């Protein structure tokens with residue numbers, strides 16, 4: 239088991255062909271989860287499942303620059319379930335982060351922060367039991 243919030247160092251930043259894998263279980267009465275790919279205090283890619291935003295389940299993605307959030311990206315598919323185990327895979331591609339949950343493609347997020355080799359940490363927070371977090375090159 240890992241302690242949440244968890245920091246996964248990404249030595250030398252991210253690069254295309256780098257695959258991040260996160261395994262955990264959603265807590266039974268979960269409200270929120272976040273992955274934060276960070277460049278110092280900036281958040282290059284925030285991936286934020288919300289289980290109860292006005293009685294709707296939605297994933298919000300965004301970037302934080304100089305402490306300001308930008309334009310949110312929202313789509314409707316919500317593959318997480320309270321109480322159940324999940325796998326998140328984040329593949330860095332040249333133009334975007336590509337995210338799959340439980341082996342099904344979910345969304346892509348275009349790179350707004352373009353100094354990929356300075357995105358040197360991943361924070362994992364919110365209403366999960368975190369089993370493992372790691373990376374490999376494909």
Ligand SMILES: OC[C@H]1O[C@@H](S[C@@H]2O[C@H](CO)[C@@H](O)[C@H](O)[C@H]2O)[C@H](O)[C@@H](n2cc(-c3ccccc3)nn2)[C@H]1O
Nearest residue numbers: 270271272284286298299300307308309310363364365
């Ligand atoms: O844009 C992404 C951010 O949105 C805000 S909320 C936002 O606020 C605007 C101004 O009022 C409204 O215009 C808009 O409609 C509404 O969506 C949210 O607080 C931010 N946030 C989430 C977390 C967090 C922490 C721990 C675990 C999980 C998540 N930390 N910061 C982060 O998601």
Ligand SMILES: [Cl-]
Nearest residue numbers: 270286287288
């Ligand atoms: Cl939230």
